[PDB]
Design a protein around this ligand. Structure first.
Ligand SMILES: *[C@@H]1O[C@H](CO)[C@@H](O[C@@H]2O[C@H](CO)[C@@H](O[C@@H]3O[C@H](CO)[C@@H](O)[C@H](O[C@H]4O[C@H](CO)[C@@H](O)[C@H](O)[C@@H]4O)[C@@H]3O)[C@H](O)[C@H]2NC(C)=O)[C@H](O)[C@H]1NC(C)=O
Ligand SMILES: *[C@@H]1O[C@H](CO)[C@@H](O[C@@H]2O[C@H](CO)[C@@H](O[C@@H]3O[C@H](CO)[C@@H](O)[C@H](O[C@H]4O[C@H](CO)[C@@H](O)[C@H](O)[C@@H]4O)[C@@H]3O)[C@H](O)[C@H]2NC(C)=O)[C@H](O)[C@H]1NC(C)=O
Ligand SMILES: *[C@@H]1O[C@H](CO)[C@@H](O[C@@H]2O[C@H](CO)[C@@H](O[C@@H]3O[C@H](CO)[C@@H](O)[C@H](O[C@H]4O[C@H](CO)[C@@H](O)[C@H](O)[C@@H]4O)[C@@H]3O)[C@H](O)[C@H]2NC(C)=O)[C@H](O)[C@H]1NC(C)=O
Ligand SMILES: *[C@@H]1O[C@H](CO)[C@@H](O[C@@H]2O[C@H](CO)[C@@H](O[C@@H]3O[C@H](CO)[C@@H](O)[C@H](O[C@H]4O[C@H](CO)[C@@H](O)[C@H](O)[C@@H]4O)[C@@H]3O)[C@H](O)[C@H]2NC(C)=O)[C@H](O)[C@H]1NC(C)=O
Ligand SMILES: CCCCCCCC(=O)OC[C@@H](O)[C@@H](OC)[C@@H]1OC(C(=O)O)=C[C@H](NC(=N)N)[C@H]1NC(C)=O
Ligand SMILES: CCCCCCCC(=O)OC[C@@H](O)[C@@H](OC)[C@@H]1OC(C(=O)O)=C[C@H](NC(=N)N)[C@H]1NC(C)=O
Ligand SMILES: CCCCCCCC(=O)OC[C@@H](O)[C@@H](OC)[C@@H]1OC(C(=O)O)=C[C@H](NC(=N)N)[C@H]1NC(C)=O
Ligand SMILES: CCCCCCCC(=O)OC[C@@H](O)[C@@H](OC)[C@@H]1OC(C(=O)O)=C[C@H](NC(=N)N)[C@H]1NC(C)=O
Ligand SMILES: *[C@@H]1O[C@H](CO)[C@@H](O[C@@H]2O[C@H](CO)[C@@H](O)[C@H](O)[C@H]2NC(C)=O)[C@H](O)[C@H]1NC(C)=O
Ligand SMILES: *[C@@H]1O[C@H](CO)[C@@H](O[C@@H]2O[C@H](CO)[C@@H](O)[C@H](O)[C@H]2NC(C)=O)[C@H](O)[C@H]1NC(C)=O
Ligand SMILES: *[C@@H]1O[C@H](CO)[C@@H](O[C@@H]2O[C@H](CO)[C@@H](O)[C@H](O)[C@H]2NC(C)=O)[C@H](O)[C@H]1NC(C)=O
Ligand SMILES: *[C@@H]1O[C@H](CO)[C@@H](O[C@@H]2O[C@H](CO)[C@@H](O)[C@H](O)[C@H]2NC(C)=O)[C@H](O)[C@H]1NC(C)=O
Ligand SMILES: [Ca+2]
Ligand SMILES: [Ca+2]
Ligand SMILES: [Ca+2]
Ligand SMILES: [Ca+2]
Lengths: 388, 388, 388, 388
């Protein structure tokens, strides 16, 4: 088994096709299913796996009460094959209220953060054993991507932040070989706040589309050079911005360089990727709440500041239903690298107060060069049918 | 591992022997089991797997209410080893309210259809990744076999229809290599309506026995040439017809060429296969409802129009019990290719209204050249013992 | 992978040591566990599996009512790794209300009987596919071993009976190669009634200790010659007889040749094996009911008619607790063949009427050349804690 | 596959990082989970497994009542991949109320003790078959490590004791090759009472840190020579002693040679390991009860009698939360052997009398050469939310 290089051209895509759905919440109403949030997807050379941060409890369980909270010692990283719901036989891979995972072609790497808010620790698990760890450097919620990291030629990269959620923070990019941290580069460039990066291989380098939780409703971009460890950053050009909250389409802006200062505070994990001058992206349909989900291509969305010409829109989740986090993952095909994405479908608190828990299911789509129709694939659970 | 060729003679059979039963409904009264319908069986070179379309819920679950409906966004293709009930550890292979699966000798292909009725999308998944997709071509419920597709020398074939359920439709035959559509041939021949084909390898080609939902209670036949992609079609000769509804044996007819216009509208997925001039087939015992199941050989049933001389009858499910869909699958033996079949055993609505759900279990038989006795292997659940 | 030959001397044992226990009934009171009976154990070259005949239902399930009955269409053969309880993820290997399984060194053989009492069918499944089948020859409950069959050099042998439970019956020995019946020999010798044989490899042949349900409380012996298919039979010499019911130790007899006509009617599956002139055997402690279980060595028990000198007794289940069926299995060690046995621990009806179901757990012991102490390992469930 | 030699230097560590947590009790409140105690962790060359002694029942189950008791016939050794909770699909590896497991590089060895207090039997299972067994030698609760044994070059060593819990007993060290006992050495040296050793490879030998239940609150040390089977023993030098109960830090003593006679009676399983003259160890935070858990390094703690200079302390479980047993396990890295430990988190009786059961979850940490922060990772279950 050889290290992955991802050295194939990116697949030409016309849009995305349905790939997977786990129906977690619907199942939780009649079965023992983990309470989760912050899910993602990543694949080894053979097959795909779904991940999520458990809350150390199932849903029909009094411990599900008040699981809206982000960080407790009982959160662990869950790992199943894609499409296998998080049942009681699910393996907890490590202790984590923040995590990232990727396969280098030989074995799995897991980056897992847990512990006190002011003094967290990140554990690096490779091939089933703990190889390294690092402590918080800003004493303010060390946190990472909540989606797959990416490895090229045996070196994996992952983006971590420590510091304010609403002000300048300390972002660093780690380079890891077989679980061992070999280099750390400070964030550099014009991005002013970085969280929860959705990264993908763009041989010879790596590209990440992130969340600015401070001043921008446009998404920061981070470029990682795997040859000399240099870092660059900026913002997605598209005038159709990908964060939530954000201004409506007629009054939103991006100049590619700075945060737009348009409803910039707060945000949601999301993704996008470049194709020449064009940009493929997803976003919530609602501009102020984590509701609905849509994807489209923006003409000149990568190269032209403020471009708002859109095409090939697809509704993934209609605006009558809740969404949440979303992220990218890459799949090596026979001749090219395909891009896929997942959408987190959050149910319960704070939006739905009949119940006392917070959880999610997922829906997953993959890039296609073929054709496709329309639909809507929401969580699908009836809140009135749920254990409270 | 090499591609399958299925280039062996068909096993000479004297009838069928008991092979498997999953007892799904009985187990649902005391455990968490998926609500399903439209099951089928397919085998890789090593072992058999049962498939079914989930309803995104377990049975003892308020979400099981009103699952009689055919198409919702939450339906997914379930896949287990044959004989493992669909418990919560079951993998959802893809999003689908219509599907087909087959193994080409190296990897699994799954064809999955989901989305809006008027604008559905079919996804083609091969070796665990999305390789292709196609959109609806007649904007009227794109739909496929609900049983195994078949592959010869790395090329898999699958029958898809789009259009009217009770009128002329648009049926196409797809040829797929490693998930990629390489050719599409329109239906051709004298079959006037084609749905839910049960196909089997008949080297060098593929033969399908289908469901005519429009004018025929006789079953359409589709012949697929894998070498030049040419298609031919007709109807099964046997005057003992295999659809439901149908006329009784004394007044049923087939001329091998046209639909018989005998209680032709509506129908049920079924199967049959040729052996020289003779025909092996299954059918519901009841001529008007999906009740009971029987198999038998029709002498001259393949070659002689309107033949009604039957032999080697076996009751599979007695007429006091509900059946449903049925389909064929092929298993490669040491010297020959065996033919097996599964029967869907539908419980709940519309027939049993004490409960609000609709689900099924299955029973499976395989061709034998030995001897056998008699019996009846129904679902066996007591409707009064079920969660409503 | 090569065929098993079992061509090593038998291990010299001083008794038996604890090997496994599944705690099924205890777990059934707080989880979804199959209702079973007629368990057995068989190992492939790597690891052991437990088998049982399910009743198509879990215990905490209204369908468990009246599962005292031996034969319904919903009984299937269950197969798990030894020590894994029969939970909802258990694979149902085939339809069976009577069965036998064994591994020839390359793949598993399963012999499964189901259908009408007067016209049953036996299916032979090898390497996950149906290879052969045979119908009832006496039209009176075709039935087999309910424990492992044994294979030498690619040929497996299994003992089947069809006919009266309380009179002369028609017993046949089948020889099966890769699932294909290659020869059938009639029972021969002086054994007058044969049921439920516990067989073991005794290179170059196979030896079975069985149940006489008609005239003997002494156990019949069947000797199977794998080279020329010839059969011989007689009775265990030991004056300490292994069946239940039976006379007490001071008035029980055996002449090695004929049934003893001592409370000979009815019986229970049991086992024994020769070591030179001596005999290792197990039996219920009670002489009239399936209560308790003990093993011991009888000096001259194999060669000397009516020998009653016992040594190395071990209590497996104390007489205050229910037992049931028991059987042998053989495990190839580095230099020798070891013998092990399991005991079925039956709970519920007819003996315990607070509940309406009948089920079992198991305990398993293996021969040892080392030393050991004492104990008692019963089912352990509190009938008052059980779902009725 | 080759035998393990553990012939690499010990990893230089700065402390420990979070590795795993199973949340068993929290999950038991909403799911079917085994009642357990005496857990441990051990790894094959590829992955880690968690073990525990089941009580033959799940938690939400009337049979969970009064599971505070240490020894019943229904206790079995449970084995899952690390991070997989003990659900109903868990394999019971053997019958045991005391056990030890390890992998020699080729296969698993399991040492399982069960039976009467005064006449117990230890079974030795290697590669899935029983190879040896030994009976009680002092007729007073034969017992072993309750943590992993260790194997060097095909020979595994395990420490067993039989006799008084509060007086001189008979401790022996067994050397086992492929399940077969090849030598037995009596304990030797100055350690006066030995129980529940936590052993680790220290090439060319094996070192164990144990529990003195009679006269010492300082932990005994057992040194095992794998080449000539010679044994030596003593006590840990550190004046900061590791047992519970124990004196507080200002009046606790150890002279390296004798039990300290400081609250020596009773105790708890624990661990420690040497690095040059220094010592890494864990212990409960409370000095009289199994509450809280902490780790630290004692400068000169291995070589200097009564040393009390501590550094690199970490809280694992805060003193508001219950702990219990703990033990070491070793993981082979690319260049070095790392040391890890697990902590048993006991909930229920005798400490929490609202419920009638006794069970545990676990948390697991591994040695790191990196950095880390702080936290607390207790069981986390709310006793008021539990089935009683
Ligand atoms: C059957 O399914 C197909 C495939 O999904 C579908 O074709 C798609 O239709 C959409 C909607 O018209 C197209 O996307 C649009 O592209 C135009 C540019 O030509 C954009 O201007 C659109 O964006 C504007 O309008 C959106 C609302 O539709 C707004 O939300 C947005 O803010 C803009 O104002 C939009 O991106 C897409 O290109 C095609 N896809 C393909 C491959 O042709 C078809 O419509 C479906 N059939 C039916 C009858 O529903
Ligand atoms: C024990 O099991 C064996 C094997 O199953 C069984 O033998 C079978 O009996 C059936 C029923 O008689 C045979 O099938 C028949 O074949 C005749 C031609 O010879 C047909 O005419 C029959 O069809 C007519 O009758 C059917 C009702 O039985 C009608 O439904 C149908 O419409 C026709 O009117 C039927 O096909 C079959 O050939 C044998 N099988 C073999 C291999 O011999 C036997 O009867 C069983 N014994 C008992 C006592 O149950
Ligand atoms: C600790 O464990 C060991 C091993 O289990 C145990 O030693 C065994 O004791 C039994 C009982 O005495 C021995 O078996 C007996 O052998 C004598 C011949 O020497 C037989 O006569 C006995 O059978 C008669 O008595 C039985 C009641 O015990 C009756 O049930 C039976 O009908 C006969 O009348 C019996 O077979 C066995 O040989 C030893 N095993 C060994 C290897 O020594 C020991 O006793 C245990 N210690 C205690 C105090 O529990
Ligand atoms: C963030 O996390 C880091 C890493 O855990 C942490 O640094 C650690 O702090 C502890 C506690 O101060 C240090 O351990 C101490 O070492 C000194 C020797 O210098 C000992 O004297 C201490 O033992 C005494 O005090 C203990 C109470 O803390 C008593 O329980 C004990 O009986 C002794 O009286 C203790 O061992 C440790 O060395 C560092 N680790 C490293 C690598 O620096 C830091 O404090 C955390 N920061 C915050 C603000 O949470
Ligand atoms: C502040 O430190 O960073 C800003 C945020 O992006 C952060 O909020 C705290 C995270 O945001 C939220 C959310 O749903 O928006 C999910 C996470 N939940 C989670 N991963 N468990 C967070 N991340 C953390 C660690 O809480
Ligand atoms: C019309 O479009 O085609 C005609 C039918 O053959 C069709 O009815 C809609 C299907 O039939 C039914 C049935 O039980 O009879 C099951 C399917 N359920 C299913 N696959 N989910 C259907 N097929 C579909 C796609 O609905
Ligand atoms: C007469 O046909 O043979 C005589 C018996 O030995 C037989 O009783 C019917 C079987 O006996 C019983 C029992 O516990 O004693 C278990 C079986 N249960 C079972 N295997 N399912 C039987 N065997 C059968 C097929 O009924
Ligand atoms: C006496 O025989 O030795 C003294 C002890 O160390 C012992 O107590 C009996 C054991 O200790 C306890 C405990 O939690 O403290 C757990 C065990 N539970 C267990 N392994 N099942 C015991 N050990 C045994 C065999 O009981
Ligand atoms: C979830 O936990 C909350 C907090 O304990 C529960 O709500 C509280 O219930 C108490 C008692 O009725 C009230 O006095 C408090 O005012 C409530 N707190 C809040 C924040 O409203 C709630 O009952 C729990 N939910 C369930 C289903 O157990
Ligand atoms: C399943 O859903 C049906 C339809 O919603 C429920 O039946 C309805 O119940 C309401 C409330 O009593 C009535 O007003 C409607 O008239 C009912 N509809 C019909 C068609 O009867 C039914 O209660 C649900 N079943 C279960 C078991 O919850
Ligand atoms: C198991 O089934 C039996 C039979 O249906 C039930 O017992 C019967 O109950 C009816 C109605 O009360 C009585 O009239 C019969 O006399 C009973 N039959 C017998 C044989 O006694 C029984 O209730 C069921 N058990 C459970 C727990 O549901
Ligand atoms: C667990 O078992 C205990 C002991 O059997 C049960 O407590 C007993 O209950 C009986 C009946 O009420 C009393 O007479 C005894 O005095 C109790 N024993 C003690 C020592 O208190 C208890 O009910 C069981 N717990 C549960 C939840 O079923
Ligand atoms: Ca923002
Ligand atoms: Ca029709
Ligand atoms: Ca008898
Ligand atoms: Ca002590």
């Amino acid at each position: 088994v050889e290290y992955r290089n991802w050295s194939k051209p990116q697949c030409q895509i016309t849009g995305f096709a349905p790939f997977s759905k786990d129906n977690s919440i619907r199942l939780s109403a009649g079965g023992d299913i983990w309470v989760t949030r912050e899910p993602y997807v990543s694949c080894d050379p053979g097959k795909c796996y779904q991940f999520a941060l458990g809350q150390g409890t199932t849903l029909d369980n009094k411990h599900s009460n008040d699981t809206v909270h982000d960080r407790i010692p009982h959160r662990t990283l869950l790992m199943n094959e894609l499409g296998v719901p998080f049942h009681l036989g699910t393996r907890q891979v490590c202790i984590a209220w923040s995590s990232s995972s990727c396969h280098d072609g030989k074995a799995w790497l897991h980056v897992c953060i847990t512990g006190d808010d002011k003094n967290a620790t990140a554990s690096f698990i490779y091939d089933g054993r703990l190889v390294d760890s690092i402590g918080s450097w800003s004493q303010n919620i060390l946190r990472t991507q909540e989606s797959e990291c990416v490895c090229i030629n045996g070196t994996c990269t992952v983006v971590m932040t420590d510091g304010s959620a609403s002000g300048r923070a300390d972002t660093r990019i780690l380079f890891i070989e077989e679980g061992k941290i070999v280099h750390i580069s400070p964030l550099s460039g014009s991005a002013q706040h970085i969280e929860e990066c959705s990264c993908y291989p763009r041989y010879p380098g790596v590209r990440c589309i992130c969340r600015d939780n401070w001043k921008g409703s446009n998404r920061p971009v981070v470029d990682i050079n795997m040859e000399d460890y240099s870092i660059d950053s900026s913002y997605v050009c598209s005038g159709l911005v990908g964060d939530t909250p954000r201004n409506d389409d007629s009054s939103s802006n991006s100049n590619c360089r700075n945060p737009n200062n348009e409803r910039g505070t707060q945000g949601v994990k999301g993704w996008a990727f470049d194709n020449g001058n064009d940009l493929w992206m997803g976003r919530t349909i609602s501009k102020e709440s984590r509701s609905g989900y849509e994807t489209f291509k923006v003409i000149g969305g990568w190269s032209t500041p403020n471009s708002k010409s859109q095409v090939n829109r697809q509704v993934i989740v209609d605006n009558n239903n809740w969404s949440g986090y979303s992220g990218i993952f890459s799949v090596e095909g026979k001749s090219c690298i395909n891009r896929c994405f997942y959408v987190e479908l959050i149910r319960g608190r704070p939006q739905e107060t009949r119940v006392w828990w917070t959880s999610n299911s997922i829906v997953v789509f993959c890039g296609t060069s073929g054709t496709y129709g329309t639909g809507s694939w929401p969580d699908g659970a009836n809140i009135n049918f749920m254990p409270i």
